[PDB]
Design a protein around this ligand. Structure first.
Ligand SMILES: O=[N+]([O-])c1ccc(O)c(O)c1
Ligand SMILES: O=[N+]([O-])c1ccc(O)c(O)c1
Ligand SMILES: [Fe+3]
Ligand SMILES: [Fe+3]
Lengths: 299, 270, 304, 270
């Protein structure tokens, strides 16, 4: 029994995307919206479905922890996730299953590697909208088990270099957890790109004629990066990441992007873009690194 | 109209685990601030918490009654946080309408199961507030807002309370120095992270006691940067703006640690 | 040998798309731009590379004719195509090859079907900007020979319904011509969708923070239609084509869409969406109907 | 300033195949108009062609010299249209800047190999204009511009010309009734497509000859719609606007068919 990282996805989590889908889980009704980005997630969904993985791992920017890197560790988590910022578009009754055994192995491996880790064992925990969203966009069936990983404070509290380094160790430790347990895992970096934005929410949110990049430079930064990604110039994006953070205010600062690539071992493999698009001016890219097809998925 | 003023910690550790002596003291001091709150006989409680994060525009809690069980995303091992919180819907909705006139885009927030932040909950539980006797007008901490804007927001609400002829108790919820320990410690040996953080807290806490608004005003931006103060001390700007930049003295009922962080309970002498 | 329509592409022609790619043939220099629509075309490019077609046939709205339907009829055509509206973004040095034999067969078959058809025999002719764009976006190599067809006035001069019938008859004649020559062909409906747009471009035309749908009503028509194309409910998209034309002011009025689908016999097949984007508020979709991957591409026994 | 005004056909058939008698007659009439043009000793010729299409803003020809061989996309079988056209850049650029001052966004056009339309080309050739002696100020036909807008555009160019002490000759280029045959005919058998068109042409042509501007103004939108007149007859609007809605009479030098469409050469008596 040997472990596998089938693939890693860049899977952004703007709640408007689920709002646009009008699923049974989400309370508010929409007239559609962000169909380009949703059609990107159509190609994500079927690429995942043809993988049949044991577990999805997801690192979310919206479960911020100060003391170490936390892991979901309760067999069944249920609840009503209302987003504090966008409660008008996102109020979602979730019901998910956690791969507690793998979560614990990641935590133990992280602990072993020098990081401080904790298992989230509280049955009443309210799962963040980033985790709920990314997952529902790539797999609305709600069937594959999940490991929810918190985003540690380090990149904001210490600085970007130290935070990224912590996030890298977490990635390496995640790899080790997958291999020691022989899991068939898919990694999910729940990160958006350029976050420099406008403060104007249209009267009716889905109005796509009011949707566009917030700054020209934001878009240009997003393009340069994802163009390097589909080129397979992985080392070069990670050389440019600090500057990309600083000038585009990109959410990959939270850490999931570094975490995912560290877990795959920074593969010089060209990525497949399912689509770029903006939500409230933010840069959002749905991408995949197919490790199985590149034959780097065996641990 | 403002009949009472307080600053209290937004950390849940005093409520969740009062068996730790220092935290026990913090809890006892927040409870004692609750008696002082009640005795001032307010009709509404103007609450601001550092943990109520908004990004788009100013959010005011408009939901008549909010209840549920909150689990802190950081301190979920020490227990749950049940809450039952009433809101002055007339004041809040007025604050929403008054807001864009003062240059701040605002929207009311009324949704079932809307997450009320840990700070607001712990201060309700410990101070005995947010009941039908003392409903709340909670304003969000917008991340893009400055202390200037926060002061303008608190003032705007006092003025909205004036033309509804109501007595206001002001509570700013948040911590002092924010050097949280980055590894798990024995809670019994929790102390303030540094002595630099300690000296800074002691100092600015003494300026609050003496009521030197002017010396406080200039120490604030330096203190906030040098001690990593919880959200740039905007939960004090709230209290200043509510009292329109004027107060006599102040009373410090508690000061202790919260996982390396500074926490304090302050009763304000108007 | 058997005639074959390998696939049908919806291949929009806003010149801003070639502008942003900075090919040798285009004169003006851009700082990138419209990369969502340009990546959408990247996939289309690779799908077609794996078809090795004998010929690409394109029906362009920007070669307007009154006296019937015209066909490129000179073996080699070259020139500098400068766009009358956006010469600041499009000034293209082109040189292409025409499948004269199939072009003549299309005219022949269209005439027999009751249409008036003309062969374009003047060698000094300058191919329209729309044709040059669709072809470059799908095939920058200029290596597959082409048949360029004019867009007849019919839908504008007479009316939509009547003009649409001519495009249908033309499509059927196109299929018949392909099957008789035994060509392995790819059809290119060089059409844009919602065309309401705003009559004002910014300082830097590439400035993507200034690019968005012109109307919500326009964008919505587009989505609804390209969804139905994805679902493969073709008969439903054509029943809606008249209202789509009236309300969204769609460039499918020009008839390339109907010509293509008529030639493909209106297959109730699912269409692959490579991407949707706006150019000058205008709705554009890059799409494909793979007829091989459905086994509907073979037409029948060739002549001679 | 305005010393001459003319309406001429935009169809290339008269210059391309003048061996067809009617076509030859229209060419000879355009040539006569060119001579009347030169006799009025203008400095610049203000041109509008129905076939110079613009969608965004108003375009004005600002390239000092354009040359090439133009091949009409409908009438390519009848030959090629060589040209060498000179623009009055000083006056053209004045029109560019002046256009928004009358509520019309505009750009100059100066690009090597920029396609001059068939109408401008054929008029230049037959009339002997667009030379260094009779340079052109050509304004585009924007599809979204009405006749009202077209007149204001022509009056504005006539304005700019007075500011430069220049004698203007005015040429509107385009057809009359536009029911082009929809099948191939023998060019020798060319005739106005239908009787209703012929009547309409003769009627408004008579109103023009007489000089009844009022009657001509009322008939124009009916005529445009009913006889499918080339681009709403904006090319006459162009002439009207340049003449400030006033003229004394008109001599119709030629009226004939062009593949079913109608076409005339008109000399305007100021
Ligand atoms: O528009 N939103 O809702 C967004 C956009 C980007 C984000 O990273 C997010 O957490 C929310
Ligand atoms: O933006 N453009 O240039 C465009 C957009 C849509 C079109 O159909 C076109 O012919 C040009
Ligand atoms: Fe986010
Ligand atoms: Fe077009």
């Amino acid at each position: 029994m040997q472990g596998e990282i089938i693939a890693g996805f860049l899977a952004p989590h703007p709640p408007h995307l689920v709002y646009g889908e009008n699923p049974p889980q989400n309370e508010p009704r929409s007239q559609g919206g962000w169909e380009v980005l949703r059609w990107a997630y159509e190609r994500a969904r079927e690429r995942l479905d043809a993988m049949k993985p044991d577990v999805l791992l997801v690192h979310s920017p919206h479960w911020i922890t100060s003391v170490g890197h936390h892991f979901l560790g309760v067999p069944e988590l249920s609840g009503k996730s209302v987003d504090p910022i966008f409660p008008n578009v996102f109020r979602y009754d979730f019901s998910l299953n956690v791969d507690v055994e793998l979560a614990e192995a990641c935590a133990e491996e992280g602990r072993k590697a020098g990081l401080v880790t904790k298992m989230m064992r509280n049955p009443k925990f309210r799962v963040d909208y980033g985790t709920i969203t990314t997952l529902h966009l790539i797999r609305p069936q709600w069937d594959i088990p999940v490991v929810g990983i918190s985003a540690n404070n380090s990149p904001y509290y210490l600085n970007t270099k130290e935070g990224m380094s912590e996030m890298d160790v977490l990635g390496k430790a995640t790899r080790e957890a997958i291999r020691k347990t022989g899991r068939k895992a898919v990694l999910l970096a729940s990160n958006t790109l350029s976050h420099w934005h406008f403060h104007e929410e249209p009267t009716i949110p889905e109005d796509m004629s009011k949707e566009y990049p917030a700054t020209m430079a934001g878009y240009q930064w997003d393009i340069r990066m994802i163009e390097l990604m589909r080129q397979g110039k992985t080392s070069e994006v990670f050389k440019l990441l600090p500057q990309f953070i600083d000038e585009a205010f990109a959410e990959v600062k939270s850490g999931a992007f570094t975490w995912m690539h560290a877990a795959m071992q920074y593969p010089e493999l060209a990525a497949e873009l399912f689509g770029y698009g903006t939500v409230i001016g933010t840069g959002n890219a749905v991408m995949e690194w197919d490790l199985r097809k590149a034959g780097l998925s065996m641990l | 109209t403002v009949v009472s003023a307080f600053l209290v910690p937004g950390t849940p550790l005093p409520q969740l685990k009062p068996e730790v002596p220092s935290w026990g003291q913090l809890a006892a001091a927040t409870e004692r601030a609750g008696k002082a709150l009640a005795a001032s006989r307010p009709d509404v409680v103007l609450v601001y918490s550092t943990q109520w994060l908004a990004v788009l525009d100013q959010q005011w809690l408009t939901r008549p009654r909010s209840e549920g069980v909150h689990v802190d995303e950081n301190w979920y091992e020490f227990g749950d946080l049940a809450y039952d919180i009433r809101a002055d819907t007339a004041l809040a909705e007025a604050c929403v309408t008054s807001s864009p006139l003062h240059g701040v885009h605002a929207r009311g927030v009324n949704y079932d199961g809307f997450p009320i932040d840990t700070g607001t909950i712990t201060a309700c539980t410990l101070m005995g507030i947010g009941t039908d006797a003392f409903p709340l007008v909670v304003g969000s901490n917008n991340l893009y807002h400055s202390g200037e804007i926060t002061e303008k927001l608190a003032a705007l609400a006092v003025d909205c309370a004036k033309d509804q002829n109501k007595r206001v108790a002001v509570v700013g919820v948040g911590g002092l120095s924010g050097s949280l320990f980055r590894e798990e410690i024995d809670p019994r040996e929790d102390r303030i992270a540094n002595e630099e953080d300690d000296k800074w807290n002691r100092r600015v806490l003494k300026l609050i006691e003496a009521g030197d608004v002017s010396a406080l005003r200039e120490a604030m931006p330096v203190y906030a940067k040098e001690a990593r103060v919880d959200m740039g001390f905007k939960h004090l700007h709230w209290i200043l703006g509510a009292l329109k930049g004027k107060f006599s003295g102040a009373n410090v009922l508690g000061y202790g640690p919260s996982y390396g962080s500074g926490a304090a309970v302050i009763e304000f002498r108007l």
